[PDB]
Amino acid sequence: PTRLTKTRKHRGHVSAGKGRVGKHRKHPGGRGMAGGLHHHRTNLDKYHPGYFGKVGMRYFHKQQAHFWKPVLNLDKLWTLVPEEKREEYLKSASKSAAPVIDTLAAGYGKVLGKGRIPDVPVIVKARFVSKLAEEKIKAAGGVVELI
Amino acid sequence: AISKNLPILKNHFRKHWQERVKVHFDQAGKKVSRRHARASKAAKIAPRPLDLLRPVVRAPTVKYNRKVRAGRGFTLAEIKAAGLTPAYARTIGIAVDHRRQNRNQEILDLNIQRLKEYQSKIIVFPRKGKAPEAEQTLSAAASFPIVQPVTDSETRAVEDNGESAYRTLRLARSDKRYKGIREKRAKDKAEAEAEKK
RNA sequence: CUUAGUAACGGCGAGUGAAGCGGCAAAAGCUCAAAUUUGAAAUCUGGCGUCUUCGACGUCCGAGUUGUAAUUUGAAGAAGGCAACUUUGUAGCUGGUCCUUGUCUAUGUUCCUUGGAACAGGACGUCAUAGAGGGUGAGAAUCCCGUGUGGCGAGGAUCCCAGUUAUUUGUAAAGUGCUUUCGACGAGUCGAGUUGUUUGGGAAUGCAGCUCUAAGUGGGUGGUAAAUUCCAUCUAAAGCUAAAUAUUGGCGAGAGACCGAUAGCGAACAAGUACAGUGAUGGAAAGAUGAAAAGAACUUUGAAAAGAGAGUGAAAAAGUACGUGAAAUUGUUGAAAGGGAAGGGCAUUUGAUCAGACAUGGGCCAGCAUCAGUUUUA
RNA sequence: AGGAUUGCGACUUUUGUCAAGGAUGCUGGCGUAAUGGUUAAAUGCCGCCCGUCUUGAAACACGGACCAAGGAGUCUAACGUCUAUGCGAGUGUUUGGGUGUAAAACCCGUACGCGUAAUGAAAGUGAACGUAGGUGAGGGCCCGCAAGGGUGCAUCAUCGACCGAUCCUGAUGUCUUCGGAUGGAUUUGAGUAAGAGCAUAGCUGUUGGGACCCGAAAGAUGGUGAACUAUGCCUGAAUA
RNA sequence: GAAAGACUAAUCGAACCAUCUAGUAGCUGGUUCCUGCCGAAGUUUCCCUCAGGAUAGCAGAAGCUCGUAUCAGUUUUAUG
RNA sequence: GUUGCUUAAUUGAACGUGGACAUUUGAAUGAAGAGCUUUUAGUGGGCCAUUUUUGGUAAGCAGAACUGGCGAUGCGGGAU
RNA sequence: CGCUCAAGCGUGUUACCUAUACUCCACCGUCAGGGUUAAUAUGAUGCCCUGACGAGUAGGCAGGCGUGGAGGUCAGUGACGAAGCCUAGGCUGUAAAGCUGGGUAGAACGGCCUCUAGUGCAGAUCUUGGUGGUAGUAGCAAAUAUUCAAAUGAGAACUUUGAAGACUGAAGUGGGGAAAGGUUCCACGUCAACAGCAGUUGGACGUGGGUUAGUCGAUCCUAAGAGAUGGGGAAGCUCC
RNA sequence: AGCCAAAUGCCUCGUCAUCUAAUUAGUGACGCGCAUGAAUGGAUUAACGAGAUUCCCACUGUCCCUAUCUACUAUCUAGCGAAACCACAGCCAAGGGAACGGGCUUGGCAGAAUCAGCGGGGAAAGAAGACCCUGUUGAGCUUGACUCUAGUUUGACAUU
RNA sequence: UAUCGAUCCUUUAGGUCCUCGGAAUUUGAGGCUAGAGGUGCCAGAAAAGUUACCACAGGGAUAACUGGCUUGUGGCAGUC
RNA sequence: GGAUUGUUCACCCACUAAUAGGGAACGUGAGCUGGGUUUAGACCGUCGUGAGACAGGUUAGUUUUACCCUACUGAUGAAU
RNA sequence: AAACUUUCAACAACGGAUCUCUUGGUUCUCGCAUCGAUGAAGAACGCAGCGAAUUGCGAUAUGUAUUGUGAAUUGCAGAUUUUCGUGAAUCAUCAAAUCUUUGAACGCACAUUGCGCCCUCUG
């Protein structure tokens, strides 16, 4: 919409929202991040920090593939099991018939502790696990199989 | 040049970018060219499908090893296992790949079943006289789909034995870090200096 | 399409910046050198002759043994022995298919008003798998060309398919089970040092010059320089190949919430033209009478151009200095004012000119009295 | 001014009356250029020429003889706050495929982006002592005739708990040098504590782009000129 | 160039013609319709900063949680 | 009451449990609603007056302090 | 201007003049605080009540007026006259503007709800095109010089013939060529423009006619120079 | 060695002599000469000079001191017919004001339309100051400024 | 109450530490935590002249000429 | 009235009644002149390694347009 | 009082804005692959009954032959009768020919319509 803008409304006045003294010239400061250490230090000391310099060490030929491992909290856990088979499983599984939850098929690396799960045997399969995550599962009844 | 409280952007437009711009106006028209091309090819070929029959293959890396996918060609070992030559297979609508190898009994069986299912369902016309035509099925992928292998038992026993999965990972990882120096510490003390004794 | 404005690069400042996997479009694979046909250079150019002439057959010189055919290419493969055999090929004729084309296939010009002219308005119909667009004296489905639906020819391309007819390939060409011996693989190259250049490539990504110069379980790579020991992966230093992808040039077709003659290409017109420069080059302006030229016969004034009349036409307030014909700027007539400028604002007066509910039966302008609100003066 | 009545009152023996929440009554003239409207001149008083840079312009500061048409914050790639819309721990059909009355409209789903977890340079590890904790304030609701008591979301302040880094402590065990139990610390993070985001569209602001419009002295690449004039060579001519 | 920075097609202290090129400018000039409401600054710190920017201050808009609060460019008593 | 602080201590110090005292919410005056958050414009050459005041013989000169004006502002008066 | 026991100077006591300031009333807008469809026609965005305030450059936000195209809708208007243009006619709005009478003219164009932009000009020593004052003015003065009749013609200071005066004075206003131009040479017709006065004349305009070589030139030879080939450079255009 | 207040001397119009009635000039001597001087050439010098400077003779409207004449313009008429410039225009004095008004303020005043002249004003026209300063804008020339480079020269390896 | 210094680079101290991404061992290089090598234009570029042959963009924010304010100085006149 | 100097100022020789001092955009360049300062040619000295510099000296060097308005000097002239 | 100056209106000038029109532009999509020593692209000079330019063609010169359609061309002439046809036409079509002098340009030269050499027929 060209009619709703403010340049339509400025037709008549001389400066067009830019002042008589300042003038609106081409490039008064510079051209993109120019004079970061000299005359735009007060901007970069505020608001940003840590901009100049270099922390850490280099990685040559890095791949976003070795570093995968998407986490999964124990709050979610039961969402991997279907909705039909839930009111059935929550009321009486009681060993020798526990619902197997393969996390890697859904797309999760490390089973990880946060929530407080109900007292039912689970038998979970996962690549990695936290120390707390195992304590909560054994308190319920189940176990953790590695892959 | 800078200064409010905005994120530092990275816009790479300091070359003559306007001279090398493309706008895809052809998207709609180019779709009809491909649908026309796929249709006109089927008219020339007539009773055969447009696609070659491809095998089932497992994917690489840690990110994608948990899924199966349609490969390139059937290998020379699997083509032999069914009961046919590689030169003959290329003219029946079966893709061959001379460089892929087999190090898995599970994938070896699956693709032998895939060839036997293919050979049974297709018919072949002779070179000489009669040719009893039976329409055309276009997509080979439709009739021969790719299904994910099931390694599942929904309800199952709970066999615990006080091992702790977390403790197993910490011990196993420590062995990889220290087997280098632990071999060399054993090559001294017990060997070299004490084999001299 | 994602990876990613990421891993790296950079007076680590400004700024620069890939690729693997994953999802799709499209998929097609292959050939030489290095082995002795050695019980028969088996191969090929040209000349001369004859035929069904993009060729085929026969014959005579030449090329070539310092290597032309057949045979084999690392996925293999060859030479022997044992063993079962499943396959075959080359012309033209007609038809379809694909192009270039030509022709055929519905329905009112009925009545009345306006007009120079119906293609306008009103009344009554007709056709519709045709109410896209254009033409005709003003907005036409039905006046004309077309459009829609489907027929019917002609002339090329021909192997893409289908169906036939000759042939006549064969004792030769191909494929596969077992077992024994072998299994030829590209050099001033690979690789190393050094200089210059380039990349995201960091003790050096590729390329090039110069000096050094290999190997046979060998050589290359595995993104930090070395020495030592393993593992995983391919086989360089010779070569061919459709498709998905590009396209401000050329030849042929469609469209547009684009411009409407100071716009849009420099150019809607005899435009790269007229014209300028020694020369490389530079480079304009300029569209519209009327439906039809019916483009003004004839008289009279004038040396003539033209003028007055007349005449054409719906109109000459359309006369080829032509549709409409604004402003600056000028002439004539009318009204007003004017003692070193004019031109404005508030308020009257005079002069000009102009809207607005006294019409049915035949509002405008003031004055006095008693009150309310605000004040003033004795 | 207003446009039925409603109110406060006063005077009334009473009904009623009234100067009491804003003007009614009676009369005359004319009914049209008379009153008003615009327009031109005259008379009284007042009035410097606009636009612009500037502490300051009528300026002896700059641009402006006059008229017509043209003529200047636009579009895009990444973005920030606010606002509307749809779905909501999810969200996004449109690279591509299927269809079609054909660039439209309609339908389809693997992936993939962002979000659901952080902190470290990295190796890595990875969020409940307790009603997801107490204290002070808190809208609203609940009990009560009230006084007051109960329950207290959002949010603000404040002291604790939990996860990561940092610095100490170093239990049972054990390839005798690995392993890290438990307990701590004037340290420290863009964390957890009954999730809020993703997509489209709009005004305003940002950075790259010709970047609101016109304006240099320069620099670089590839070409054309000795008919003027500078100098040498070859061949001619001219000077009482 | 018998020397004046002379002449080199009216062009010379570095010719002319096209292209890169819409070269860059902290500097000059311009920047197109009405009413309505609010209404500034020329000051602090840093800068090859002094005809210029960043940063705070002043201004507008959008509002959110509440509803007489613990407030005031002021006075008084006490006390520095 | 609370403790690993502190005490010769059964003391102290912080944060508390329950309890007593609301006309007289413990000076005056006013209150135009109070508190708070995000975002972005222009500006960053200033100048004059009354007192205080430094340099200078002095200046319609230069440079500070406290309020008020002009700049951004017409209107009545100072003839202008 | 003029003023002298003031119309001067110092002081006192009254009246009177007067700002967009102050008080009161009418109307406009903005902001706040209320009341109301309880069937009760017409806009709940409605219809009322009460109170305060109004200057403003740079700047910000709000509500409207107009221009060119796109989707919808008034079965809108129109050759019985659409658009445009002119008008000391009229009506509405604070205004941007809109509606309408009279004239001119001869084919298309409006309102209301939305979409969209190459969307509004007085200035830029702005760009292109046109026209003024200045002004019937500056001026049309160097190369010694013209005069009298006759003819043609509508028309003669300027053309053709006669007569008289003059000049260049043979290093010339004479007779021929080179470079360069290209029909300007020559005849017949004829004056719209050009010949800065005029025009019957013309190097103008219209239509034709005209350049004859064995011996004059070019052609042929070489000059200062230029320039293939055989060769050698250079990625190459090409260089020696 | 020479030469001089010299085209080289600041203090200066140097001091002495001569030319004139009178000379910041001219010529001749003097010289601790701001800062003369020997092929970055010193001193002298016949002829020559559209070179610079002083005086004398003759000559004259340069001057005391202006006057007169001739042609061609201007002037008037017939015909033909432009440009620069221009916000709007054109009477003065004082005041205040961006400190020197043609317009504002207070006085003087003020009469159609016009023609020759003229240079007092219009801070009159000409050209986005060339002098001066500023710009983080340039170019020409110079050099022990900073970083390079063709050419040349020395050494090593190849040609061997 | 004064006596001094970022990024990047080099360097030293410290730890039974982390990394060289096909797997190991030793050298080597790269990281994590604190010092030193200096920017005096001291919130920190690496930098010599000249133009009278000159150029462009601007400036009365700023000199050389008048005019105005001022009168030390110059000039003229009083007082005891 | 004259000598010298581009001069303002200065210093002399005479005459004379006397040879007083000043202003008017430091009056007066579309009124003249161009000796001076003040561009480019060139020479000398001091200074500079050099290009060049010198409030040192010396010589050669471009002075445009009125026809308009007012002003002044003269000259006609409608209407009582 | 006129003339003269200034403002307005009607008619007439000057000039070409405004309004309506449009065989041209600009962008986007879709299809196809074809220049030349058999002499190309470009250049000069010619050709019509009456043409200067533009449009066509090359001394066979606004074209010839071949095929299709079936009566024109038109500013003014003029035919031809070809008009129940092996045929009008500035028509469409296009497969046989012509193609001046040049140009990559080719006998050697080329500010020249310059100068040679070989085979062959006729004077």
TrEMBL record, chain A:
<feature type="compositionally biased region" description="Basic residues">
    <location>
        <begin position="1"/>
        <end position="13"/>
    </location>
</feature>
<feature type="region of interest" description="Disordered">
    <location>
        <begin position="1"/>
        <end position="39"/>
    </location>
</feature>
<dbReference type="GO" id="GO:0022625">
    <property type="term" value="C:cytosolic large ribosomal subunit"/>
</dbReference>
<keyword id="KW-0689">Ribosomal protein</keyword>
<feature type="domain" description="Large ribosomal subunit protein uL15/eL18">
    <location>
        <begin position="71"/>
        <end position="145"/>
    </location>
</feature>
<feature type="compositionally biased region" description="Basic residues">
    <location>
        <begin position="20"/>
        <end position="29"/>
    </location>
</feature>
<dbReference type="Pfam" id="PF00828">
    <property type="entry name" value="Ribosomal_L27A"/>
</dbReference>
<dbReference type="InterPro" id="IPR021131">
    <property type="entry name" value="Ribosomal_uL15/eL18"/>
</dbReference>
<dbReference type="GO" id="GO:0006412">
    <property type="term" value="P:translation"/>
</dbReference>
<dbReference type="InterPro" id="IPR030878">
    <property type="entry name" value="Ribosomal_uL15"/>
</dbReference>
<dbReference type="GO" id="GO:0003735">
    <property type="term" value="F:structural constituent of ribosome"/>
</dbReference>
<protein>
    <recommendedName>
        <fullName>60S ribosomal protein L28</fullName>
    </recommendedName>
</protein>
<keyword id="KW-0687">Ribonucleoprotein</keyword>
<dbReference type="InterPro" id="IPR036227">
    <property type="entry name" value="Ribosomal_uL15/eL18_sf"/>
</dbReference>
<dbReference type="InterPro" id="IPR001196">
    <property type="entry name" value="Ribosomal_uL15_CS"/>
</dbReference>
<comment type="similarity">
    <text>Belongs to the universal ribosomal protein uL15 family.</text>
</comment>
UniProtKB/TrEMBL annotation, chain B:
<dbReference type="GO" id="GO:0003723">
    <property type="term" value="F:RNA binding"/>
</dbReference>
<keyword id="KW-0687">Ribonucleoprotein</keyword>
<dbReference type="Pfam" id="PF01294">
    <property type="entry name" value="Ribosomal_L13e"/>
</dbReference>
<comment type="similarity">
    <text>Belongs to the eukaryotic ribosomal protein eL13 family.</text>
</comment>
<dbReference type="GO" id="GO:0006412">
    <property type="term" value="P:translation"/>
</dbReference>
<dbReference type="InterPro" id="IPR018256">
    <property type="entry name" value="Ribosomal_eL13_CS"/>
</dbReference>
<dbReference type="GO" id="GO:0022625">
    <property type="term" value="C:cytosolic large ribosomal subunit"/>
</dbReference>
<dbReference type="GO" id="GO:0003735">
    <property type="term" value="F:structural constituent of ribosome"/>
</dbReference>
<protein>
    <recommendedName>
        <fullName>60S ribosomal protein L13</fullName>
    </recommendedName>
</protein>
<dbReference type="InterPro" id="IPR001380">
    <property type="entry name" value="Ribosomal_eL13"/>
</dbReference>
<keyword id="KW-0689">Ribosomal protein</keyword>
